[PDB]
Design a protein around this ligand. Sequence first.
Ligand SMILES: OC[C@H]1O[C@H](O[C@H]2[C@H](O)[C@@H](O)[C@@H](O[C@H]3[C@H](O)[C@@H](O)[C@@H](O[C@H]4[C@H](O)[C@@H](O)[C@@H](O[C@H]5[C@H](O)[C@@H](O)[C@@H](O[C@H]6[C@H](O)[C@@H](O)[C@@H](O)O[C@@H]6CO)O[C@@H]5CO)O[C@@H]4CO)O[C@@H]3CO)O[C@@H]2CO)[C@H](O)[C@@H](O)[C@@H]1O
Ligand SMILES: OC[C@H]1O[C@H](O[C@H]2[C@H](O)[C@@H](O)[C@@H](O[C@H]3[C@H](O)[C@@H](O)[C@@H](O[C@H]4[C@H](O)[C@@H](O)[C@@H](O[C@H]5[C@H](O)[C@@H](O)[C@@H](O)O[C@@H]5CO)O[C@@H]4CO)O[C@@H]3CO)O[C@@H]2CO)[C@H](O)[C@@H](O)[C@@H]1O
Ligand SMILES: OC[C@H]1O[C@@H](O[C@H]2[C@H](O)[C@@H](O)[C@H](O[C@H]3[C@H](O)[C@@H](O)[C@@H](O)O[C@@H]3CO)O[C@@H]2CO)[C@H](O)[C@@H](O)[C@@H]1O
Ligand SMILES: OC[C@H]1O[C@H](O[C@H]2[C@H](O)[C@@H](O)[C@@H](O[C@H]3[C@H](O)[C@@H](O)[C@H](O)O[C@@H]3CO)O[C@@H]2CO)[C@H](O)[C@@H](O)[C@@H]1O
Ligand code: GLC
Ligand code: CA
Ligand code: CA
Ligand code: CA
Length: 637
Amino acid sequence: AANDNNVEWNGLFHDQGPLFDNAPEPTSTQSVTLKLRTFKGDITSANIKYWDTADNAFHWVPMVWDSNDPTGTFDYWKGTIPASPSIKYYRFQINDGTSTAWYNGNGPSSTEPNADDFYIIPNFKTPDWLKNGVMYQIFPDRFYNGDSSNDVQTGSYTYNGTPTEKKAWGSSVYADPGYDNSLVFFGGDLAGIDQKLGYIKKTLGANILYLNPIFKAPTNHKYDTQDYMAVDPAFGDNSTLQTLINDIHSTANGPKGYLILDGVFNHTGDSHPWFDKYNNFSSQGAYESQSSPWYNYYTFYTWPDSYASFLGFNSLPKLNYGNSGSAVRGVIYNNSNSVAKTYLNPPYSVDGWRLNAAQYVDANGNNGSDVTNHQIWSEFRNAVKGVNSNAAIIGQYWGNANPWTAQGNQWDAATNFDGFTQPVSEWITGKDYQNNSASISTTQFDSWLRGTRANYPTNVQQSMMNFLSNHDITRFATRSGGDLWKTYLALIFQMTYVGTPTIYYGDEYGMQGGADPDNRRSFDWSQATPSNSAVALTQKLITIRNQYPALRTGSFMTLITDDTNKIYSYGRFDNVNRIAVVLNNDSVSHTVNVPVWQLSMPNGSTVTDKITGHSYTVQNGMVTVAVDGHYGAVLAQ
Ligand SMILES: OC[C@H]1O[C@H](O[C@H]2[C@H](O)[C@@H](O)[C@@H](O[C@H]3[C@H](O)[C@@H](O)[C@@H](O[C@H]4[C@H](O)[C@@H](O)[C@@H](O[C@H]5[C@H](O)[C@@H](O)[C@@H](O[C@H]6[C@H](O)[C@@H](O)[C@@H](O)O[C@@H]6CO)O[C@@H]5CO)O[C@@H]4CO)O[C@@H]3CO)O[C@@H]2CO)[C@H](O)[C@@H](O)[C@@H]1O
Ligand SMILES: OC[C@H]1O[C@H](O[C@H]2[C@H](O)[C@@H](O)[C@@H](O[C@H]3[C@H](O)[C@@H](O)[C@@H](O[C@H]4[C@H](O)[C@@H](O)[C@@H](O[C@H]5[C@H](O)[C@@H](O)[C@@H](O)O[C@@H]5CO)O[C@@H]4CO)O[C@@H]3CO)O[C@@H]2CO)[C@H](O)[C@@H](O)[C@@H]1O
Ligand SMILES: OC[C@H]1O[C@@H](O[C@H]2[C@H](O)[C@@H](O)[C@H](O[C@H]3[C@H](O)[C@@H](O)[C@@H](O)O[C@@H]3CO)O[C@@H]2CO)[C@H](O)[C@@H](O)[C@@H]1O
Ligand SMILES: OC[C@H]1O[C@H](O[C@H]2[C@H](O)[C@@H](O)[C@@H](O[C@H]3[C@H](O)[C@@H](O)[C@H](O)O[C@@H]3CO)O[C@@H]2CO)[C@H](O)[C@@H](O)[C@@H]1O
Ligand SMILES: OC[C@H]1O[C@H](O)[C@H](O)[C@@H](O)[C@@H]1O
Ligand SMILES: [Ca+2]
Ligand SMILES: [Ca+2]
Ligand SMILES: [Ca+2]
């Protein structure tokens, strides 16, 4: 490069990783020093332009040359944004004579962008254990039956006129004639999870468990809560839960663990005493009497049969959050004995909440995604963090969750359907997560990923729940048509990307399944051993991620987007390690010359494909590696 009236985009780079930002989660008194990379001698001047919410105006900070990288290929320019309590958004103006380029969350641009700027949110912090961990999601009734004595038998009880049905482990989840899909039970329970912690924390290595609903409810999924204060009898009792938590937190059976529970706060089930549609309690519920002490917990259009609910489901009456200080806000999160605080305090001390149907939470039966909804989650955050600042808050949302994350006053992160699940699905399987035809190329995949990461503050990106499948979509293995190699590829990407890798129970061995309820099949053990190639790889990949902080909180830089050979390569790096990931999405092998010079890997230095152990030497800024179809290499040093 040179001063030739031309800014070379290829040399430009900035994100909030260690090498470029000295304070990614600053307080009100910490200034933020940013470094912008360019090719050596490529520019004449650079400036930081930031919008300060304190005075609704743009501010200008000229940058100064700081240093060259170790390879002498790049320049690092530096500038500092002053400390204050206000949210700020910045972008860079880069000039080389008559050539000007702009750069922000979405990368380089010839024209000045007006969105996707980088975020500075003083005092906003997401749990570091979440950014650095690996999560494992379990749908309780389908994981492991550790205690047959609490099993729901066929006919054990009836819900809304339909008796329960017990299935033999491994059999179909579909209810037989006379029964209902939501009342089919296999016997999975908390004792079972506890007895299988060795598999989770050791065989695989995940240190975070996220469970679907576990509180008393008539269905097998239990999103129709009957009692938030009691573990459902089929899963055990509150004592069973305390034991599981102790064993998860224990460091004697593996790495320290964390537990995230599913918080179903938008609505309750129609069998909850506050509503009591079928008179299952001596108390008077809202459905039973307009004089009920809980009458105003719900919204009736025509008492008692027409009321606000979750997506028209009468079995899920919607809670009326009213105004600040309401009884409903009290029982859900404000009270010390609320649902949210009870489990965050001893003798439970869980580590977080996954917020079900979070976008709908509102007052008066309204549908959320409004001022009131965000006000509620802001109060929720204060209540939760007040009890445990390191308790995680992850909201369910299918699209861009910027509205609930980008001001640092609500959630720490969200279910990454839009920034992870969907793009990964369409790139690898050629199907969207609902198993409908939808395919994207490598260049499109890369662009999609960048644009979605740019929707969030950096700490939020690093805390997103990144799963290949989950209880509301089709299994990855079904979308892949049963091709296990596609799962191999997906796992390598998942374990080396930005955000919390999240494994939906069974995905690690290639479990198949269509739409709900077929995506909740019973866990086929004996398939859960290193003898299964996907399980062995999963274990290896988790060990790799845990070895390199760069894979969890390091910068992310695109290296190769080859649509001809279907090769995707990106680097994860920080002040200590530089890692070049090389993915082959083709059905045949490809030998790739990886431009590791972009990550500043010194010539003559050694790089190791942590997956195979095969060592390589960097020469002329390159490293040549052969990669099988639907597979990948993780070249680290
Ligand atoms: O009269 C005042 C002033 O006049 C002169 O400077 C002016 C200069 O003539 C004019 O071109 C312009 O300068 C531009 C420059 O053209 C741009 O390239 C840019 O300069 C920055 C450069 O791009 C960066 O790479 C960085 O340079 C670093 C290197 O990266 C380091 O490796 C190191 O290299 C030096 C090495 O250590 C020495 O042994 C020797 O080999 O020389 C090497 C090159 O100097 O250090 C340099 C310097 O830190 O940083 C550069 C910025 O300093 O942007 C410039 C500003 O737009 O404008 C100049 C006005 O000041 C005259 O040279 C000055 O002495 C005099 O004070
Ligand atoms: O919440 C959903 C929302 O999420 C995302 O929005 C976020 C942005 O991506 C992010 O950059 C940040 O936005 C800041 C912005 O960075 C900051 O500069 C300031 O915005 C300025 C514009 O930069 C400036 O150009 C001007 O905007 C003009 C615009 O140029 C003109 O074309 C026309 O549209 O009139 C606009 C109004 O003047 O002024 C604004 C401020 O007045 O402030 C922004 C925050 O308000 O944060 C966003 C929210 O988190 C997605 O990008 C977005 O699509 C989603 O709707
Ligand atoms: O709806 C199908 C559609 O999905 C697209 O995926 C990405 C977009 O590429 C990406 O732009 C977008 O991310 C943000 C966008 O850049 C902003 O302009 C603004 O709209 O906020 C968005 C927040 O997500 O996300 C979508 C994922 O839904 C595919 O690119 C496109 O090919 C496909 O048809
Ligand atoms: O038989 C009625 C319907 O049953 C099925 O829908 C169930 C889901 O199976 C159950 O998980 C739950 O959905 C929740 C979903 O899992 C959660 O991620 C989302 O955020 O909130 C949903 C509600 O809490 O409840 C529904 C409704 O009972 C089945 O899929 C559907 O077709 C049947 O009509
Ligand atoms: O899908 C990746 C691999 O699949 C099969 O093993 C092919 O024999 C091999 O050529 C290819 O690299
Ligand atoms: Ca130039
Ligand atoms: Ca059982
Ligand atoms: Ca009653």
